[PDB]
Amino acid sequence: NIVTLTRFVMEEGRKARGTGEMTQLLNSLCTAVKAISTAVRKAGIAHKLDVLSNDLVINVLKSSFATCVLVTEEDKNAIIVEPEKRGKYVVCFDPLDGSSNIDCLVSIGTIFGIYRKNSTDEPSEKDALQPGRNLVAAGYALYGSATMLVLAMVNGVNCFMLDPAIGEFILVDRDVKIKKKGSIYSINEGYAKEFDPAITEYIQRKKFPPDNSAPYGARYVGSMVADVHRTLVYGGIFMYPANKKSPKGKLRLLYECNPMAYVMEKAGGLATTGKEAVLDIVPTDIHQRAPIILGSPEDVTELLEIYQKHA
Amino acid sequence: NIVTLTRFVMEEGRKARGTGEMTQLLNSLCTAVKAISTAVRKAGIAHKLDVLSNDLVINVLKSSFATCVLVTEEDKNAIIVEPEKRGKYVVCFDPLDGSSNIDCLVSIGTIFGIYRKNSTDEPSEKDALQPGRNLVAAGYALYGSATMLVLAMVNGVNCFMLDPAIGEFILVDRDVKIKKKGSIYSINEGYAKEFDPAITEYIQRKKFPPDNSAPYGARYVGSMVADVHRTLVYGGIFMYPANKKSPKGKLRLLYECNPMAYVMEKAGGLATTGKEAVLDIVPTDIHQRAPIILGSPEDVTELLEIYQKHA
Amino acid sequence: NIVTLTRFVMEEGRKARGTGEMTQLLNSLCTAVKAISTAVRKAGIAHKLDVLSNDLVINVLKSSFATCVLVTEEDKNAIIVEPEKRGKYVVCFDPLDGSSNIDCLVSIGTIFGIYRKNSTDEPSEKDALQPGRNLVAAGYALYGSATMLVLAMVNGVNCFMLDPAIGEFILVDRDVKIKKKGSIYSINEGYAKEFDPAITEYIQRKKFPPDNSAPYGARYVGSMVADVHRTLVYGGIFMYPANKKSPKGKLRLLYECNPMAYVMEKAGGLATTGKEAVLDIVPTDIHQRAPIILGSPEDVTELLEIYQKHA
Amino acid sequence: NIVTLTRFVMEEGRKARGTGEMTQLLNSLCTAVKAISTAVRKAGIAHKLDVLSNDLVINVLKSSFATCVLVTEEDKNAIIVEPEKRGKYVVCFDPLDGSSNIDCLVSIGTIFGIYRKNSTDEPSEKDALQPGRNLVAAGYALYGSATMLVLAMVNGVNCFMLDPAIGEFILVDRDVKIKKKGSIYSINEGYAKEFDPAITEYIQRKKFPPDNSAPYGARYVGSMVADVHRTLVYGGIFMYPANKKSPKGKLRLLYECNPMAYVMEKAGGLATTGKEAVLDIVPTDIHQRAPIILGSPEDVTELLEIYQKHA
Ligand SMILES: O=C(O)CCc1c(C(=O)O)[nH]c2cc(Cl)cc(Cl)c12
Ligand SMILES: O=C(O)CCc1c(C(=O)O)[nH]c2cc(Cl)cc(Cl)c12
Ligand SMILES: O=C(O)CCc1c(C(=O)O)[nH]c2cc(Cl)cc(Cl)c12
Ligand SMILES: O=C(O)CCc1c(C(=O)O)[nH]c2cc(Cl)cc(Cl)c12
Ligand SMILES: O=P(O)(O)OC[C@H]1O[C@](O)(CO)[C@@H](O)[C@@H]1O
Ligand SMILES: O=P(O)(O)OC[C@H]1O[C@](O)(CO)[C@@H](O)[C@@H]1O
Ligand SMILES: O=P(O)(O)OC[C@H]1O[C@](O)(CO)[C@@H](O)[C@@H]1O
Ligand SMILES: O=P(O)(O)OC[C@H]1O[C@](O)(CO)[C@@H](O)[C@@H]1O
Ligand SMILES: [Mn+2]
Ligand SMILES: [Mn+2]
Ligand SMILES: [Mn+2]
Ligand SMILES: [Mn+2]
Ligand SMILES: [Mn+2]
Ligand SMILES: [Mn+2]
Ligand SMILES: [Mn+2]
Ligand SMILES: [Mn+2]
């Protein structure tokens, strides 16, 4: 099948009585996603991807007539869109996430978060410094064995799979919700020596259950998009906390943490730094970093009560 | 590029003065691999994959006229090929590996190992009970953001990437070699409570280097073909040792362990149980399990040395 | 590349200050075109096309929220769109033209013509009975060795080629214009015995030039879309006049003749029945037939002066 | 379906007790055909085709180790294959036929005929100067709304359609036979002034049946592979006789006429100059031209009888 992404976003646009700008925005982004997907599929045949990916996303978004401020992980500064092409939305994105693993055939992905412009002064970088709680839509595309587009908005999370015979995204999972409790923990344990006592304690309880509990299985792809998507569909928890390398975490607030935290929350899951909901952090820099812990609410909660006890 | 998989195996057949049977076998397999790839890419759009995958591999292999005995993970007993279609090769395969992960859009794969039939009596299940050291060829296809086919034989290991525009696998890396030393370890730490003392000590050295040498990074996708591929291309070590639930290990010797062990050894790596080369084990059952440790020669050796000390 | 059809129609929408309905309409139609294109490409692999084609076009157009009255060559009656999905445009189309030749691998095509609704009473079949001169846009998709979408509007004719790696139409020829004079005539000469004296005379002058003129070459694919597209890009003339079989011609006014006549005229060519401009005919039946003669203005004019002389 | 082209030629090689050389030759050719297909499908998106096509065919053929002498329409002299790569087959081909029509999105194609080298002296251009009757195999690929590969050999003619999802040609019609009598004639009537008297009389009988039998319908795409394919599948007759500009005809004997004549005869049709079987002509030059008349046995015979009467 019935539903294409195009059909779905238009029907949501009309149900919310929008102008249609969102529908242009998402239709454009879908074009860049398809192109990134085919380029990653033929990467080794060539004759940088993240530079081609960045330009694809930038151009299609500029030409959607739906945006005014763009933040890319690949650009030092926020891009302020030409007046002629200006629309009302602010888009934060990571055009090609996990690209230290394109070489290892690793599910990589594009991550985005969309805001309605704040003020009415000339659009500026400050318009992208909004808490994640003001997101109107967010999601990611996962370039894997299939190309999948996960989109979250006020009414929930929907999963769309790229049909390569026609170049359209087909709705395959409506209203996704994560399990309340999972049996998988995901973290890079090579940082063991730098982990705080809370994380250290939780990791230990996962592995040495106070007996007779089966231990959780461990998974860590090393690409956020793959690890978050597994967490969404099969449940459990994902962690990239602060360590010594970065005592503010590694992952980026605006276009890595917020978008995943917004999907998680709309699926019925949680997302926190250990001390506050990721979505209520107010950024001060467009490239700011945040620690993140996200996943099924029972597991996330368990970890947050370890944080509380140690405090 | 220059070289299609079709051209490469023909060239290799002639250099080896073969009958061409191995060539029809590899070309047939290739058709099954392209078909699996496409079905995984549009799996959510459907309207089991490992049943369809099993059938694809069985069919193209029977019809290649190159094979007499087939062992699949999905079948209780070996399939004996009808006389009219028999050729001389014994093929052991895992048609769709990592299928607990298709749901989480995760690199899954096809694993195969090819034997020359042993005897001259009627072909039977016993013809597949050969040590890995007698392999003529082995490899895997990895269904990821790109489709890769890795093929190892006496002259080395070669990597081919699927060009979806023409349905041909293109040679993208000739004579692949693993790095002598890596910096990544891969294992499900979820089983820590059941790990033997040597694995326990090696893991702790990887996270708390004695030395003020940087800790190894951790990765574990949970699909063998993804984990072995990353090990092959970036180096380090992959481990699936025996634990409690599996005192003989989890992974299958004939169609998971041997192929990967063969690929590794041809790439200049190592592959051991902790006590003997996986490729010298003589299976006693077609679905036998074996513990396995494989990867860069320095990392694996280092582990072997700990086993030695604890003995 | 620079320009996608999607980019192009939106930029035309904004230059004409439209509501965006046209852009939804054309984006939807583009989806059905891609699907028809892949289904015709794999037709023989199956496991009727014009029934699948008709439903594709109908559904995507209904769901565009841009249409109120649909006329298909495959439906007896005009389809009046549900109030909820109603938009202002009336679409006439031939979903799969030339389908007595899918069997012969013949370039077949989809043909459409779009009108703005006339009245304000409830939308009805009468809203599709407009002269071709009221068209706001028209064109065709040609399923050939490449899939091409030719779109004509007030500022001209543009040609877009389907990029199968990303499922987008890329602008490859802007502002197409036909040659003033061609050297090819296209007609089914098997109807010789039924042709009027005007057509008979013109055919004879093409073949037996009053000497020293090179004769025109003859071409007739038997699929309007292929024959018109050749006429557009290389010039010359195309004829499907009245005969005895149908003394009103064979081709359909609303969704075969008008659309081709509108493209021709916007390319700088002509289109007539022999007695009046096709575009000024006012239909009386949605399935009405018209004789048509179209192509480079010098050739069309020559034929029309043969008609005048015989009158 | 059951049968891929790869499987079918292997099966046929074994039944014929071949060396496998013809099998590598056909598989190689197949790769060139898939590549040409894709480049024609995205030709307008570029950023000459017959130069690229020439190079594709030459390269895959040289690298098949199956060939010693190559005749292409695009090369002055025969290409003699380097000793290391030589095999026993002589291949005559038209890499991209109908290329005056790519511009008008029109079915174009690859035509090939394969000979066994004659002598034992050094391979040379003379090895290609064999009557069509010595063909071992011939056919064509037709790049249209679908890509088809038609392959004829001693056991008959077979049609394969390209499945773009897996890059394999699938057997869709086994043992193809032309109808004994058709109802379509195909010829460029643009040359009527230069036609011999027998062709003139046959054309007039087709349009004004003596009999009150329905006139034949006319078709002429202007690309031989398209016209011969329609003739093969629906019946009737295709004609390219000598005229003034070409007193020996236009079409090329070795790589246009012979292959089509071979396909036709294997399908139970006929192929003549008007005076002898095209397949019994002995070429005197690699780029020799021949007049040709081919198609259903009743239609062709009927024409032959008129030639007889006028003699
Ligand atoms: O915040 C808004 O009002 C825009 C949200 C929106 C619109 C719209 O306002 O037009 N249309 C949509 C379609 C999808 Cl799928 C998702 C969202 Cl959030 C939307
Ligand atoms: O020893 C033999 O019988 C052949 C080995 C072989 C053949 C063949 O006989 O056709 N084809 C091959 C392709 C590759 Cl990649 C590797 C080998 Cl050993 C081969
Ligand atoms: O007749 C009209 O006003 C609609 C024409 C139109 C619009 C619009 O009004 O919004 N947008 C377009 C885009 C393209 Cl490509 C072509 C046309 Cl006719 C159009
Ligand atoms: O006579 C021969 O040498 C073989 C004929 C042949 C071969 C082969 O030798 O490999 N392969 C074929 C494929 C087809 Cl479709 C037809 C023929 Cl005759 C063949
Ligand atoms: O190697 P590390 O430090 O575990 O980091 C891996 C993480 O970094 C990234 O590669 C880059 O953001 C993420 O996709 C992933 O979650
Ligand atoms: O969940 P576990 O015990 O870590 O098992 C993972 C292993 O199981 C499999 O999915 C199937 O054998 C392998 O691909 C993978 O390496
Ligand atoms: O066979 P005829 O009578 O020449 O008609 C062919 C014409 O009919 C159609 O097949 C059907 O509309 C057209 O595509 C084409 O122009
Ligand atoms: O224009 P003409 O003389 O009818 O020539 C058409 C012929 O020329 C070619 O395009 C090239 O030989 C053939 O495919 C076709 O049959
Ligand atoms: Mn990035
Ligand atoms: Mn990133
Ligand atoms: Mn399996
Ligand atoms: Mn398995
Ligand atoms: Mn029709
Ligand atoms: Mn029609
Ligand atoms: Mn040519
Ligand atoms: Mn030619």
Domain boundaries, given as residue ranges, for chain A:
2-175, 176-310
Report which secondary-structure segment, H or E, holds C29: helix C21-41
Which amino acid is residue A293, in one-letter code? I
**Bridge partners for C233 per DSSP:** none
Ranges of H-type helices in B45-132? 49-63
CA distance B307 to C207: 93
Annotated binding site of A for substrate: 97-100, 188-191, 219-224, 240, 250-252
CA distance C278 to C302: 17
Which amino acid is residue D244, in one-letter code? K
Contact C237, C293 (CB under 8 A): yes
Contact C144, D107 (CB under 8 A): yes
Contact B157, B263 (CB under 8 A): yes
CA distance A297 to A301: 6
Half-sphere exposure of B106 (CA within 13 A, CB side): 31
Structure determination method: X-ray
Q: With an 8 Å Cβ cutoff, are D222 and C217 in contact?
A: yes
**B120 marked among binding-site residues:** no
**Closest by CA position to D297, among listed D207, D233, D235, D253:** D235
Most A CBs within 10 A among C2, C6, C60, C147, hence the mutation to make, goes to C6
Q: Please report residues of A whose CB lies closer than 8 A to that of B109.
A: none
**Closest by CA position to D166, among listed B148, B32, B149:** B32
**Closest by CA position to B292, among listed B306, B264, C141, B266:** B264
Planar angle of CA B80, B143, B78, nearest 5 degrees: 10
Q: With an 8 Å Cβ cutoff, are A167 and C34 in contact?
A: yes
Report which secondary-structure segment, H or E, holds C52: helix C49-62
**Closest by CA position to D9, among listed D176, D163, D160:** D160
- How many CB atoms are closer than 10 A to CB A247? 12
Region D1-175: CATH code: 3.30.540.10
CA distance D155 to D174: 10
CA distance B196 to B144: 33
Q: Please report residues of A whose CB lies closer than 8 A to that of C26.
A: none
**Bridge partners for B72 per DSSP:** B93
Number of residues assigned to chain D: 311
Planar angle of CA C259, C262, C265, nearest 5 degrees: 150
Q: C307 is written with which tokens?
A: 């008609």
Local structure of A230: helix, strand or coil: helix
Q: A238 is written with which tokens?
A: 């994902």
**D251 marked among binding-site residues:** yes
CA distance A99 to A106: 8
Helix axes C5-15, A21-41, angle to 10 degrees: 160
**Closest by CA position to A40, among listed B42, B177, B175, B148:** B148
Are β-strands A156-163 and A147-153 bridged in parallel, bridged antiparallel, or unpaired? antiparallel
Contact D224, D216 (CB under 8 A): no
Q: Please report residues of C whose CB lies closer than 8 A to that of A31.
A: 4, 6, 166, 168
C-D C-beta contacts closer than 8 Å? 163
Integer CA distances (angstroms), C38 to C31, C43, C215, C307, in order: 11, 8, 39, 43
Contact A239, A196 (CB under 8 A): no
Local structure of B115: helix, strand or coil: strand
The residues, any chain, with a CB within 8 Å of residue C199's CB and separated by 6 or more, are C187, C239, C241, C303
The residues, any chain, with a CB within 8 Å of residue B119's CB and separated by 6 or more, are B127
For ligand 7, atom 16, which residue shows the shortest CA distance? C224
Q: Please report residues of B whose CB lies closer than 8 A to that of D28.
A: 6-7
Q: In what order do the strands lie in the sheet with B217-218?
A: B217-218, B184-186, B237-240, B292-295, B270-272
The residues, any chain, with a CB within 8 Å of residue D6's CB and separated by 6 or more, are B27, B28, B31, D27, D30, D168
Write out chain D in H/E/C secondary structure: CCCEHHHHHHHHHHHCCCCCHHHHHHHHHHHHHHHHHHHHHCHHHCCCHHHHHHHHHHHHHHHCCCEEEEEECCCCCCEECCHHHCCCEEEEEEEEECCCCCCCCCCEEEEEEEEECCCCCCCCHHHHCCCHHHCCEEEEEEECCCEEEEEEECCEEEEEEEECCCCEEEEEEEEECCCCCCCEEECCHHHHHHCCHHHHHHHHHHHCCCCCCCCCEECECCCHHHHHHHHHHHCCEEEECCCCCCCCCCCEHHHHHHHHHHHHHHCCCEEECCCCEHHHCCCCCCCCECCEEEECHHHHHHHHHHHHHHC
CA pseudo-torsion sign C174, C177, C178, C179: negative
Most D CBs within 10 A among C5, C104, C211, C245, hence the mutation to make, goes to C104
CA distance D155 to D138: 12
Are β-strands C67-72 and C79-80 bridged in parallel, bridged antiparallel, or unpaired? antiparallel
* Facing B34 at nearest CB: one of D11, D38, D168: D168
Q: Tokens 């953001």, residue?
A: B145
Report which secondary-structure segment, H or E, holds C295: strand C292-295
Nearest-atom index, ligand 7, CA of C252: 12
Report which secondary-structure segment, H or E, holds B259: helix B258-266
Q: How close is the nearest chain A Cα to the Cα of B122, in Å?
A: 40
Contact A292, A271 (CB under 8 A): yes
Integer CA distances (angstroms), A126 to A254, A282, C11, D196, in order: 12, 11, 29, 83
CATH 3.40.190.80 matches D176-310: yes
Helix axes D197-207, D297-310, angle to 10 degrees: 130
CA distance A249 to A242: 4
CA distance B276 to B290: 11
CA distance C233 to B4: 37
Nearest listed ligand to the Cα of residue A169 = 1
Q: Please report residues of B whose CB lies closer than 8 A to that of A143.
A: 145
Q: With an 8 Å Cβ cutoff, are A226 and B106 in contact?
A: yes
Q: With an 8 Å Cβ cutoff, are B145 and A207 in contact?
A: no
Neighbours of chain A (3+ CB pairs under 8 A): B, C
Neighbours of chain B (3+ CB pairs under 8 A): A, D
Are β-strands C184-186 and C168-176 bridged in parallel, bridged antiparallel, or unpaired? unpaired
CA distance D82 to D86: 6
CA distance A181 to A216: 11
CA pseudo-torsion sign C57, C59, C64, C69: positive
Nearest-atom index, ligand 6, CA of B256: 12
Resolution in A: 2.2
CA of C252 to the centre of ligand 13 (A): 10
Q: In what order do the strands lie in the sheet with D292-295?
A: D217-218, D184-186, D237-240, D292-295, D270-272
Report which secondary-structure segment, H or E, holds C175: strand C168-176
Contact B270, B240 (CB under 8 A): no
Q: With an 8 Å Cβ cutoff, are D168 and B167 in contact?
A: yes
* Facing D190 at nearest CB: one of C173, C218, C229: C218
The residues, any chain, with a CB within 8 Å of residue D63's CB and separated by 6 or more, are B7, D28, D85
Q: In what order do the strands lie in the sheet with D156-163?
A: D79-80, D67-72, D89-97, D108-116, D137-143, D147-153, D156-163, D168-176
CA of A49 to the centre of ligand 9 (A): 10
CA distance B303 to B274: 8
Q: Give CA torsion, residues C236, D38, B43, C57, to 10 deg.
A: 0
The distance from CA D54 to its chain's CA centroid, rounded to whole angstroms, is 16
Confirm or reject: Cβ of B19 under 6 Å from ligand 2. Answer: yes
**Closest by CA position to A258, among listed A230, A287, A278, A239:** A278
Are β-strands A237-240 and A184-186 bridged in parallel, bridged antiparallel, or unpaired? parallel
Integer CA distances (angstroms), C310 to C232, C295, C305, in order: 28, 21, 9
DSSP letter assigned to residue B54: H
Nearest-atom index, ligand 3, CA of C114: 18
Contact B251, B134 (CB under 8 A): no
Confirm or reject: Cβ of D16 under 6 Å from ligand 4. Answer: yes
CA distance D283 to B310: 82
For the residues of A254-287, what is the DSSP string, one character each?
IIIIHHHHHHHHHTT-EEE-SSSBGGG---SSTT
CA of C13 to the centre of ligand 3 (A): 5
**Bridge partners for C72 per DSSP:** C93
Q: A118 is written with which tokens?
A: 């704040």
**D98 marked among binding-site residues:** yes
CA distance C48 to C167: 24
Q: D22 is written with which tokens?
A: 């013809």
Q: Give CA torsion, residues C78, C82, C88, C89, to 10 deg.
A: -30
E strands within B106-187?
108-116, 137-143, 147-153, 156-163, 168-176, 184-186
CA pseudo-torsion sign C219, C225, C231, C234: negative
Give the architecture (CATH level 2) of A2-175. 2-Layer Sandwich (3.30)
**Closest by CA position to D96, among listed D293, D253, D239, D256:** D256
**What are phi and psi for residue D118, nearest 5 degrees?**
-60, -80
Planar angle of CA D247, D250, D251, nearest 5 degrees: 135
Q: B151 is written with which tokens?
A: 């093929």
* Facing B207 at nearest CB: one of A144, A193, A234: A193
A-B C-beta contacts closer than 8 Å? 163
Mutate to test the pocket of ligand 8, among D73, D107, D110, D240 (most ligand atoms within 8 A of CB): D240
Q: A124 is written with which tokens?
A: 């500026």
**Closest by CA position to A223, among listed A182, A268, A188, A198:** A188
Mutate to test the pocket of ligand 3, among C136, C149, C160, C174 (most ligand atoms within 8 A of CB): C136
B85-94 burial code (b ≥16 CB/10 A, e <16) = ebbbbbbbbb
**What are phi and psi for residue D234, nearest 5 degrees?**
-115, -15
CA distance A95 to A196: 31
Q: Please report residues of D whose CB lies closer than 8 A to that of B168.
A: 31, 34, 167
